[PDB]
């Protein structure tokens, strides 16, 4: 937001900013559009399957060992070994203290993991 970053919550500064026009609305609109675009990007990239599929318990895939990439049952989440390795491979309050908030993503990591697992199950 503008009135808090620009002005330290004082009447004089706000009343001075009031005469500069509708800059704040433009900036807020741009940032909101950016966030909506990010959510649309995530949904378009992952939500490619109509129904969540389920891999069978039988692992007789012609000798092709798929244990590395299939979802891990003995884990708090459903992320696979490769997925967890990548997650492990890759101060916040100060920015929020001046009116710079970080919104949470619409799709949490577990939903993305479910989508990926369904895609692999359907493919195999």
């Amino acid at each position: 937001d503008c009135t808090m970053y620009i002005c330290g919550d004082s009447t004089e500064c706000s009343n001075l900013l009031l005469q500069y026009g509708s800059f704040c609305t433009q900036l807020n609109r741009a940032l909101t559009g950016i966030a909506v675009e990010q959510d649309k990007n995530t949904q378009e990239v992952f939500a490619q399957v109509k129904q969540i599929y389920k891999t069978p318990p039988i692992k007789d895939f012609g000798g092709f060992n798929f244990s590395q990439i299939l979802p891990d049952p003995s884990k708090p989440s459903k992320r696979s070994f490769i997925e967890d390795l990548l997650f492990n491979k890759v101060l916040i309050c100060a920015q929020k203290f001046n009116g710079l908030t970080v919104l949470p993503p619409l799709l949490t990591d577990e939903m993305i993991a479910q989508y990926t697992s369904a895609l692999l199950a359907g493919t195999i």
């Binding site: 970053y5 620009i6 001075l16 950016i34």
Partner: peptide, 19 residues
């Protein structure tokens, strides 16, 4: 106020291009 407005505008433009 002018300085902070300019800084915020530059940040917004950079974010738009990166987006």
């Amino acid at each position: 106020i002018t300085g902070r407005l300019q800084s915020l505008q530059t940040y917004v433009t950079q974010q738009l291009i990166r987006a």
